[PDB]
Amino acid sequence: TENQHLKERLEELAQLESEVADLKKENKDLKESLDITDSIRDYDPLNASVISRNPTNWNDQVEIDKGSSDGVKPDMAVTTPSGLIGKVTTTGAKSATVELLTSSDVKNRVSAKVQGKENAFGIINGYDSDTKLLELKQLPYDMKFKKGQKVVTSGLGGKFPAGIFIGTIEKVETDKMGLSQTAFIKPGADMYDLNHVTVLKRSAEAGTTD
Amino acid sequence: QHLKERLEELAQLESEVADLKKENKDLKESLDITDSIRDYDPLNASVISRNPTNWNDQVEIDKGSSDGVKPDMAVTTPSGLIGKVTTTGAKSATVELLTSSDVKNRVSAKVQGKENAFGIINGYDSDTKLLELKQLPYDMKFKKGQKVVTSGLGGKFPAGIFIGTIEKVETDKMGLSQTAFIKPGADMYDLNHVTVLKRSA
Amino acid sequence: QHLKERLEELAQLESEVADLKKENKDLKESLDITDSIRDYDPLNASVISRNPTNWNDQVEIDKGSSDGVKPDMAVTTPSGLIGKVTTTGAKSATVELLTSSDVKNRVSAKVQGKENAFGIINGYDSDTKLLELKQLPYDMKFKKGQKVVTSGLGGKFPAGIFIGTIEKVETDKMGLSQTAFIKPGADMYDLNHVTVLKRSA
Amino acid sequence: TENQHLKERLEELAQLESEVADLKKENKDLKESLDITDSIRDYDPLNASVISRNPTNWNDQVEIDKGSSDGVKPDMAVTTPSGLIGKVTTTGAKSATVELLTSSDVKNRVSAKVQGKENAFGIINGYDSDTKLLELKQLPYDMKFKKGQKVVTSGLGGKFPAGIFIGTIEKVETDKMGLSQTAFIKPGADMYDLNHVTVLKRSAEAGTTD
Amino acid sequence: SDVKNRVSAKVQGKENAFGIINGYDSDTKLLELKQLPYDMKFKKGQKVVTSGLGGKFPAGIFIGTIEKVETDKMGLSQTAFIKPGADMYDLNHVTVLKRSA
């Protein structure tokens, strides 16, 4: 099994890797042809490790070994290879606190986009400990969603680069008012056990519309 | 071990593909119409912020004062006019969209036809998703499909910018003018790359 | 006494007004495009029957065999192509509409563009209200708004008949061709006056 | 009162009368400019009187003094100045039976159109003795209707001329399936007391699509 | 024989039709021109050149000749079989086109 499937995978994986690199290069040329600098998807990453996590508030917060003097700033996105895990909240000289998507803070939110033949925008806001699902609120009521669509950061909140993978639509429903839809999402990154992590500095100019 | 290493960063890769594809297509479309409007002295910008609260009213771009961006300048995409610059900052600016709910928001328009009629675009319906073209000559006849562009009467926008298509047409109460309802050409729900027209010469 | 005499026949009068207005407008539109297609030898007809059961598939017109109407002839309105004649009778005939659900219903189409691409219109979605334009060249690029007309390849319809507008465009599975979704120009939900093109010379 | 309102009415009535006549003439010219004969709205009327009505089936049927030898034929529309009242069902040499809109025959129906900035089509089918309302079934589910819109004959059933006034939308609702709408209509013609009536021969070719 | 190998082609004719060259038969020694407009008519001998649609090759490069033409199953398009102009069995001197301007 340790080579029965990864043969068709680690292989079909490099498949997407080169496809990207090509698109990624083409995209770079286009933006150069036009006068486009610091687009909404660009960013400078910084690697870091979780150095402390309290079981009392395990799903709310984590502490990393990088801080102010390393360039870390409040509101920077924090991720892992398989997805978005949170944002920097408070920073010290050499360490910082990051609030996880699974946090119980009702004010916690992130601007997101649901990829489809036609994209839709909404706000991720709310985690359910039982269902293990993120709430995607305010999607257009007339657009139709299917289980499996990918959700990524829109960057429209002004602080995260766009394109970071968040998760997958798992369930969809209409809200009481009948004005919008709400999708429930399965985070792609596993946040129960965090060790190695990456803090993203957003390149695009900061937005004040929030 | 490497059974999760390059296995998890999969969905992230499929997402990069999808996003790059769309951004490349849109960016290509931008290149073609380049020389097509080189005269208006174009400035390419990115939408860097949009609030869900007033989603249809405005958007923020990463170009401002120090880039030649000044309030009232036209903002467009390859498929259409999307708005005008309002408040400007040093490195960014706010753009009022045609889909705005601000009742004072207006744009001088012309219907391309045998005979050219002028009108004021002023009003957007969230439901029908149509733009209101008020004040057209009461006895002139319009047909579904006629193209609507900016008139230029007012110095603000250059003339010739495509706005949308005549969808419906009706006579208002007074019996003095006609109102056409227009399908915007540009898609303003999903904005990313945008163009500021600095000069209307 | 006369308090009901000319009082009741009121709503009936207001109805005559509304109906005549619409019929006059549509009829005027017909006159303008007259010489515009005098070559195709037009035959003006009225829809005389339509069943709610198969509303979107067909319609019956008051012209047939003894009028020169023959199956496969194009049927149109000022704002667009609406179908083709199928079974014909002495004084009437059945018209298959573009909105039909008959999967075998097809029309050869051409997209007017820098480079002209041909495709087959084959399929209508009741929900999106869009026509399926299949088989367009995989590497040619299409933009929302390009006009689609009949190609003529097949002898059936004359070429140049306006069909609709490119709304969306996508690549099919195979990766061999593209499919555009089209907004029909003509309104087929409300048909009354119609035109049969007898000759495609 | 017998001249306090009819002064502003019989006057404002001739108002619509001349407006029509003008449109009506213009329409005639247009149809002549194009080669349009026997359009969907043309017809030859015949005057008649109700000569018998049984209280046992008062709302189902009525008998008129014109028949076969007068040109009356089954399926011809029967009206009065204020609206449509029914259709001819069986004919004899000098008299005929006409089924009223208020009939209890569930199979009874008429193709209709709801006038609006954008017309809608449906089938009138069913009368409620209590509410005194006609059922307009199968109107498009996404179109919106307002109380007061006029309903007329569409002619699409192949037997009536189009344009005969039927009544007014009074109530509107969505059906269980959620596929269409149903409007309830107030007949314009009062069918409780019928005397003078008019049988319409349809000019347009007959339709077999029914 | 690489099934993913493709080239965008155009048939020079009264009306120009586009298609994708994708497939070579060792036996008939013919190139497969897929996706041509179903109701357009092609004749043996029409010349096929590169279309350029895709930025890769310059347009106008001669590819071969229409030999046979047939309608595929679907009844949506036509496939022509083409006789390559160049002889690829014996290659020695060759030319690389650096710019497609």
The answer to whether residue C139 neighbours chain E at the CB level (below 8 Å) is yes
D30: nearest CB among C31, C47, C59: C31
* CA B24 remoteness from chain centre: 20
Q: For residue A24, give its domain range.
A: 1-39
Instruction: Kindly list the residues from chain B whose CB atom is less than 8 angstroms away from the CB atom of residue C145.
Output: 79, 165, 185
Collapsing DSSP to helix, strand or coil, A180 comes out as strand
Instruction: Kindly list the residues from chain E whose CB atom is less than 8 angstroms away from the CB atom of residue C140.
Output: 18, 53
- Sorted by sequence, the CB contacts under 8 Å of residue E68 that are 6+ apart come out as E30, E44, E80, E81
User: Do C153 and E76 lie within an 8 Å CB cutoff?
Assistant: no
What is each CA distance from D112 to C20, C111, D120, E69, in whole angstroms?
A: 17, 38, 8, 53
Pairing between β-strand B42-49 and β-strand A165-174 as defined by DSSP bridges: unpaired
The answer to whether residue C146 neighbours chain B at the CB level (below 8 Å) is no
CB contact at 8 A, D45 and D198: yes
Q: What is the spatial distance between Cα E84 and Cα E65, in angstroms, rounded to a whole number?
A: 7
**C53 and C102 belong to one structural domain:** yes
User: Do C140 and E18 lie within an 8 Å CB cutoff?
Assistant: yes
CB contact at 8 A, C109 and C103: no
Cβ-based neighbour number of residue B117 at 10 Å: 22
Residue-wise burial string across D17-30, b where 16 or more C-beta atoms lie within 10 A, e elsewhere: eebbeebeebbeeb
- Sorted by sequence, the CB contacts under 8 Å of residue C53 that are 6+ apart come out as none
What is the DSSP secondary structure assignment for residue D207, as one 8-state letter? P
Nearest to C154 by CA among C118, C124, C180, C194: C118
- What's the total number of domains in chain D? 3
Could you write out the DSSP letters of every residue in A85-145?
EEEEEEE-SS-EEEEETT---TT--EEEEE-SSS-EEEEEEEEETTTTEEEEEEEETTS--
Using a 10 angstrom Cβ sphere, with 0-12 exposed, 13-18 middle and 19 or more buried, the burial of residue D46 is middle
The token duo for D115 is 């006038």
Q: What is the spatial distance between Cα D162 and Cα B66, in angstroms, rounded to a whole number?
A: 67
User: Do B46 and A39 lie within an 8 Å CB cutoff?
Assistant: yes
Collapsing DSSP to helix, strand or coil, A197 comes out as strand
User: Do C44 and D36 lie within an 8 Å CB cutoff?
Assistant: yes
Q: Which contiguous run of DSSP H or E holds residue D86?
A: strand D83-91
Could you write out the DSSP letters of every residue in D49-65?
EEEE--GGGTTTEEEES
Residue-wise burial string across A139-148, b where 16 or more C-beta atoms lie within 10 A, e elsewhere: bbeeeebeee
User: Do A23 and B21 lie within an 8 Å CB cutoff?
Assistant: yes
The CATH code of the domain that includes E67 is 2.40.10.350
Alpha-carbon torsion (D80, D85, D89, D92), positive or negative: negative
CB contact at 8 A, B159 and B151: yes
Q: Which phi-psi region, left, alpha or beta, contains residue C185 (left: φ > 0; alpha: ψ -120 to 50)?
A: alpha
**A199 and A99 belong to one structural domain:** yes
Task: Provide the total of helices (H) and of strands (E) in chain D, helices listed first.
Answer: 1, 12
**D99 and D115 belong to one structural domain:** no
What is each CA distance from A72 to A158, B115, C77, C179, in whole angstroms?
A: 17, 62, 66, 47
Bridge partners (DSSP) of residue B183 are B165
**C114 and C175 belong to one structural domain:** yes
CB contact at 8 A, D168 and D186: yes
Residue A70 — φ and ψ, nearest 5°? -105, 0
User: Do B16 and A20 lie within an 8 Å CB cutoff?
Assistant: yes
Q: What is the spatial distance between Cα E51 and Cα E41, in angstroms, rounded to a whole number?
A: 19
Which residue do the tokens 């003339």 mark? B159
Nearest to A72 by CA among A49, A56, A55, A53: A49
Give residues 166 to 185 of C whose Cβ lies within 8 Å of E.
176-177
Q: How was this structure determined?
A: X-ray
Distance from CA of C145 to the nearest CA of D (A): 24
Q: What is the spatial distance between Cα A182 and Cα C3, in angstroms, rounded to a whole number?
A: 59
Q: Which of B129, B143, B149, B183 to probe by mutation at the C interface, max C CB count within 10 Å?
A: B143
Q: Which contiguous run of DSSP H or E holds residue D22?
A: helix D6-33
Pairing between β-strand A150-153 and β-strand A165-174 as defined by DSSP bridges: antiparallel
Nearest to C80 by CA among C156, C167, C147: C147
User: Do C79 and B185 lie within an 8 Å CB cutoff?
Assistant: no
Nearest to B132 by CA among B169, B176, B173: B169
Nearest CA in chain E to C108: E39
Q: Which phi-psi region, left, alpha or beta, contains residue B154 (left: φ > 0; alpha: ψ -120 to 50)?
A: left
User: Do B144 and C185 lie within an 8 Å CB cutoff?
Assistant: yes
**A122 and A174 belong to one structural domain:** yes
Q: Which chains have at least 3 CB atom pairs separated by less than 8 Å from chain A?
A: B
User: Do A36 and B28 lie within an 8 Å CB cutoff?
Assistant: no
The answer to whether residue C15 neighbours chain D at the CB level (below 8 Å) is yes
Give residues 98 to 117 of B whose Cβ lies within 8 Å of A.
none
Alpha-carbon torsion (C78, C163, C154, C142), positive or negative: positive
**B69 and B26 belong to one structural domain:** no
User: Do C79 and B29 lie within an 8 Å CB cutoff?
Assistant: no
Which residue do the tokens 């049969």 mark? C196
Which residue do the tokens 């699902």 mark? A133
Q: Which of B19, B25, B58, B96 to probe by mutation at the A interface, max A CB count within 10 Å?
A: B19
Q: What is the spatial distance between Cα A200 and Cα C186, in angstroms, rounded to a whole number?
A: 52
Give residues 81 to 100 of E whose Cβ lies within 8 Å of C.
none
Instruction: Kindly list the residues from chain C whose CB atom is less than 8 angstroms away from the CB atom of residue E77.
Output: 135, 177
Q: What is the spatial distance between Cα B184 and Cα B126, in angstroms, rounded to a whole number?
A: 12
Alpha-carbon torsion (D74, D76, D78, D83), positive or negative: positive
| Dihedral angle, C-alpha B2, B5, B6, B7, nearest 10 ° | 90
**B100 and B192 belong to one structural domain:** yes
Bridge partners (DSSP) of residue C195 are C44, C76
Q: What is the spatial distance between Cα B183 and Cα B164, in angstroms, rounded to a whole number?
A: 5
The answer to whether residue A196 neighbours chain B at the CB level (below 8 Å) is no
The token duo for D72 is 């009356």
- Euclidean distance between the first and the last CA atom of chain E, given in angstroms as a whole number: 30
**A123 and A72 belong to one structural domain:** no
Nearest to A153 by CA among A162, A141, A144: A162
Could you write out the DSSP letters of every residue in chain C?
-TTSHHHHTTHHHHHHHHHHHHHHHHHHHHHHTSGGGGGG-EEEEEEEE--GGGTTTEEEES--GGGT--TT-EEEETTEEEEEEEEE-SS-EEEEETT---TT--EEEEE-SSS-EEEEEEEEETTTTEEEEEEEETTS---TT-EEEE--TTSSSPTT-EEEEEEEEEE-TTSSEEEEEEEESS--SS--EEEEE----
Which residue do the tokens 């009068």 mark? C13
Cβ-based neighbour number of residue B111 at 10 Å: 25
What is the DSSP secondary structure assignment for residue D175, as one 8-state letter? -
Q: What is the spatial distance between Cα D160 and Cα D206, in angstroms, rounded to a whole number?
A: 9
What is the DSSP secondary structure assignment for residue D93, as one 8-state letter? S
What is each CA distance from A183 to B14, C124, D126, in whole angstroms?
A: 20, 30, 43
Q: What is the spatial distance between Cα B129 and Cα B189, in angstroms, rounded to a whole number?
A: 11
C50: nearest CB among D13, D34, D156: D156
Q: What is the spatial distance between Cα B111 and Cα B177, in angstroms, rounded to a whole number?
A: 14
Chains A and B touch (3+ CB pairs under 8 A): yes
Nearest to B19 by CA among A86, A27, C179, A166: A27
**D184 and D115 belong to one structural domain:** yes
Which residue do the tokens 């001349």 mark? D18
The token duo for B122 is 């002023």
The CATH code of the domain that includes A93 is 2.40.10.340
Instruction: Kindly list the residues from chain B whose CB atom is less than 8 angstroms away from the CB atom of residue C78.
Output: 143
User: Do E37 and C177 lie within an 8 Å CB cutoff?
Assistant: no
Nearest to C191 by CA among C109, C103, C79: C79
Collapsing DSSP to helix, strand or coil, B85 comes out as strand
Give residues 46 to 75 of B whose Cβ lies within 8 Å of A.
46-52, 55, 58-60, 62
User: Do C14 and D19 lie within an 8 Å CB cutoff?
Assistant: no
- Residues C20, C22, C26: CA angle, nearest 5 degrees: 115
CB contact at 8 A, D168 and D150: yes
Q: Which amino acid is at D201?
A: K
User: Do E38 and C135 lie within an 8 Å CB cutoff?
Assistant: yes
Strands (E), E2-88: 7-11, 17-25, 30-37, 47-50, 62-71, 77-84
Distance from CA of E55 to the nearest CA of C (A): 9
The token duo for C42 is 């037009």
Q: What is the spatial distance between Cα C19 and Cα B185, in angstroms, rounded to a whole number?
A: 33
Resolution expressed in Å? 2.5
Instruction: Kindly list the residues from chain C whose CB atom is less than 8 angstroms away from the CB atom of residue D119.
Output: 22, 190
The answer to whether residue B78 neighbours chain C at the CB level (below 8 Å) is yes
Size of interface C-E (CB pairs under 8 A): 43
Alpha-carbon torsion (D193, D195, D196, D198), positive or negative: positive
- Sorted by sequence, the CB contacts under 8 Å of residue C63 that are 6+ apart come out as C43, C45, C69, C91, C92, C93, C196
- Residues C11, D8, D150: CA angle, nearest 5 degrees: 15
Collapsing DSSP to helix, strand or coil, D106 comes out as coil
Q: Which amino acid is at A98?
A: V
Q: What is the spatial distance between Cα C113 and Cα C165, in angstroms, rounded to a whole number?
A: 12
Q: Which phi-psi region, left, alpha or beta, contains residue E75 (left: φ > 0; alpha: ψ -120 to 50)?
A: left
Distance from CA of C176 to the nearest CA of E (A): 7
**B76 and B88 belong to one structural domain:** yes
The CATH code of the domain that includes D15 is 1.20.5.490
Which residue do the tokens 């100045």 mark? D81
Chains D and A touch (3+ CB pairs under 8 A): no
Q: Which contiguous run of DSSP H or E holds residue D29?
A: helix D6-33
Residue D124 maps to a domain: yes
Using a 10 angstrom Cβ sphere, with 0-12 exposed, 13-18 middle and 19 or more buried, the burial of residue D148 is exposed
**B119 and B51 belong to one structural domain:** no
Could you write out the DSSP letters of every residue in A18-38?
HHHHHHHHHHHHHHHHTT--S
The answer to whether residue D24 neighbours chain C at the CB level (below 8 Å) is yes
**A195 and A184 belong to one structural domain:** no
Instruction: Kindly list the residues from chain A whose CB atom is less than 8 angstroms away from the CB atom of residue B12.
Output: 81-83, 164-165, 188
- Angle A6-33/B11-32 helices, nearest 10 degrees? 30
* CA B9 remoteness from chain centre: 36
* CA A200 remoteness from chain centre: 11
CB contact at 8 A, A60 and A102: yes
Collapsing DSSP to helix, strand or coil, B132 comes out as strand
